[PDB]
From a paper:
Sterol 14α-demethylase (CYP51) is the cytochrome P450 that removes the 14α-methyl group from the sterol core. The molecular evolution of cytochromes P450 and associated redox-driven oxidative catalysis remains a mystery in biology. It is widely believed that sterol 14α-demethylase (CYP51), an essential enzyme of sterol biosynthesis, is the ancestor of the whole P450 superfamily given its conservation across species in different biological kingdoms. Herein we have utilized X-ray crystallography, molecular dynamics simulations, phylogenetics and electron transfer measurements to interrogate the nature of P450-redox partner binding using the naturally occurring fusion protein, CYP51-ferredoxin found in the sterol-producing bacterium Methylococcus capsulatus. Our data advocates that the electron transfer mechanics in the M. capsulatus CYP51-ferredoxin fusion protein involves an ensemble of ferredoxin molecules in various orientations and the interactions are transient.
The lanosterol-bound M. capsulatus CYP51-fx fusion protein was crystallized in the P1211 space group, and the structure was resolved to 2.5 Å resolution. The asymmetric unit consisted of four molecules of P450, the active site of each containing one molecule of lanosterol. In all the three structures the sterol 14α-methyl group lies within 4.1–4.2 Å from the heme iron, i.e., they are clearly captured in the catalytically competent orientation. Firstly, there is an additional H-bond between the sterol C3-OH and the side chain OH of Y186 (located in helix F’’) not seen in eukaryotic CYP51s. This bond strongly implies that M. capsulatus CYP51 binds sterol substrates with higher affinity than its corresponding eukaryotic orthologs. A second unique feature of the M. capsulatus CYP51 structure is that binding of the substrate does not free the side chain of E178 (helix F) from a salt bridge, an event essential to activate proton delivery in the eukaryotic CYP51 orthologs. Although the H-bond with the CYP51 family signature histidine (the residue preceding the conserved P450 threonine in the I helix, H260 in M. capsulatus) is lost, a new and stronger salt bridge (2.8 Å) is now formed between the E178 hydroxyl and the neighboring H259 (this residue is unique and highly conserved in bacterial CYP51s15). This indicates that, in contrast with the eukaryotic CYP51s structures, the presence of the substrate alone does not complete switching the M. capsulatus CYP51 domain to an active conformation. Despite these readjustments, however, the electron density for the ferredoxin domain (or even the [2Fe-2S] cluster) in the structure of the fusion protein was still absent. Upon binding of the substrate all these three residues were shown to lose their contact with the heme, the side chain flipping up towards the proximal P450 surface and playing a role in the ET process.
Author numbering: 6 to 448
Write the structure that this text describes.
């Protein structure tokens, strides 16, 4: 039929990659503003269709895996996780790799996690000093590594996390580059450093495994399970695969969540009217319950909603992609096989027909309004359809647990001008800007 509007101005051989890569959010916003719900642009030779608003986002999330696939779209992750891991695997092996974390997400170990997160938060706070100034993002990133390593991989893997590990995960994270969606292997300094980080991490996990074999005393874990893990065909998981799934599991638990946990604290200090309501329902469950339980955090609607609104305005994953395997239509336009197709939470969340006065921070979420369930394909920080986030329960839990432990025994103040705090829209995993300072004081 008719086909999508293609954006002009594409440089020769590079398409819009230069414009896109400077500020991906800004590019995608401008593309929707110009051409509406379905708009094509080029990343080098790759023809990309931005799908925005409810109807087009529905087509994206609801498409069968035989028409829209994640695999070719996410080659970027192959040099990070390793060959044959998640998206670089056959489906049957991918599903089995995802199924080996699912046990850590069940009701039973979740009662366990509340005490581990508090332990970890207090562990970093003991070394503090009564009043001072910290970088909120630098801390939150470090904290979510300990928090997610301990909870989902166990105390055994958490005991070895060091500075080498800290740098290794920053080098791995820096592998996520606008150019890397198209050409994930290039003779670049950012790529060599990610490759070196992975090789090094695989050497340290292999050594930790050699040791656990000699001791042979250590057992009872999710990491131990991986070490002993085989596929349903009885193939043994290698050190390479195990390393890949430890990386994937910290990307999931830590890299998604560092920014959005910083933002919750920033956004409450910016709007002290919501700080007072959140700090009320925290102290309220500090009073009624003893310490922070799991059911206590499940019944915290004020905080649940500030996180929900933080995710509408600061969705960390701003570009979800599929390769188009079979021609399909949206709003009566033929998106041809071989093209790629994109969802943009950052931009769909800012559509005024879906979120009246989009740029206003208003946590009217669990209220009669219900702007998030109004269209499961509107609000989409966690995606939608078959390949929706399968870890949202733990994600929301982890940041709740962290913030209402921080705000229960520290007073916070923005060390700079409240408007100074912005998102670095130069990254694909969007977090607050580079230097992000804050001040504290015990209660
Ligand atoms: C606020 C933090 C988080 C955000 C914003 C987030 C966002 C997302 C999004 C947008 C996707 C879909 C990507 C796509 O459609 O291609 C996704 C998938 C996924 N997320 Fe998360 N996530 C978060 C935290 C977590 C955590 C903590 C875990 C695990 C503990 C996790 C596990 C997963 C998994 C396994 C998938 C793949 C789903 C599948 O293909 O079956 N996420 N996440
Ligand atoms: C322990 C295991 C096997 C868990 C599986 C975790 C993965 C499915 C998650 C971890 C990080 C994750 C959320 C991510 C993404 C998808 C799902 C991932 C890979 C993607 C690739 C979505 C598209 C984004 O543009 C971007 C490239 C930033 C992210 C990176 C992190």
């Amino acid at each position: 039929s008719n086909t999508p509007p293609v954006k002009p101005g594409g440089l020769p051989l590079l398409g819009h990659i230069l414009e896109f890569g400077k500020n991906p959010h800004a590019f995608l916003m401008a593309l929707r503003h110009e051409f509406g719900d379905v708009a094509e642009f080029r990343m080098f030779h790759q023809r990309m269709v931005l799908l925005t608003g409810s109807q087009a986002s529905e087509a994206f999330y609801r498409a069968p895996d035989e028409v829209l696939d994640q695999g070719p779209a996410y080659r970027i992750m192959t040099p990070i996780f390793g060959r044959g891991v998640v998206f670089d695997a056959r489906i049957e092996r991918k599903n089995q790799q995802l199924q080996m974390l699912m046990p850590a997400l069940r009701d039973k170990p979740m009662r366990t996690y509340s005490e581990i997160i508090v332990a970890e938060v207090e562990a970093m706070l003991r070394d503090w000093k009564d009043a001072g100034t910290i970088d909120l993002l630098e801390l939150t990133k470090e904290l979510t590594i300990y928090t997610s390593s301990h909870c989902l991989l166990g105390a055994e893997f958490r005991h070895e996390l060091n500075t080498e590990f800290a740098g290794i995960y920053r080098d791995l994270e820096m592998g996520i580059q606008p150019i890397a969606y198209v050409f994930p292997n290039l003779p670049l300094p950012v790529f060599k450093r990610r490759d070196q980080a992975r090789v090094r991490l695989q050497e340290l996990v292999t050594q930790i495994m050699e040791r656990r074999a000699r001791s042979q005393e250590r057992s009872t874990n999710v990491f131990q399970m991986l070490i002993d893990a085989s596929y349903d065909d009885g193939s043994k998981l290698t050190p390479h695969e195990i390393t890949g799934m430890l990386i994937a599991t910290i990307f999931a638990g830590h890299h998604t969540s560092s920014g959005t946990t910083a933002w919750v604290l920033i956004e409450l200090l910016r709007r002290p009217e919501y700080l007072r309501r959140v700090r009320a329902e925290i102290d309220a469950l500090f009073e009624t319950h003893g310490r922070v339980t799991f059911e206590s955090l499940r019944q915290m609607p004020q905080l649940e909603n500030v996180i929900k609104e933080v995710l509408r305005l600061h969705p960390p994953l701003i570009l979800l992609m599929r390769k188009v395997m079979k021609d399909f239509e949206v709003q009566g336009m033929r998106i041809e096989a071989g093209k790629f197709v994109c969802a943009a939470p950052s931009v769909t969340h800012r559509i005024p027909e879906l979120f009246p006065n989009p740029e206003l921070f208003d946590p009217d979420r669990y209220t009669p309004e219900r702007a998030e369930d109004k269209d499961l394909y509107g609000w989409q920080a966690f995606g939608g359809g078959r390949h929706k986030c399968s870890g949202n329960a733990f994600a929301m839990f982890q940041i709740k647990a962290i913030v209402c432990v921080l705000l229960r025994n520290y007073e916070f103040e923005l060390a700079a001008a409240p408007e100074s705090y912005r998102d670095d829209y130069r990254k694909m995993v969007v977090e607050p800007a580079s230097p992000c300072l804050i001040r504290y004081r015990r209660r």
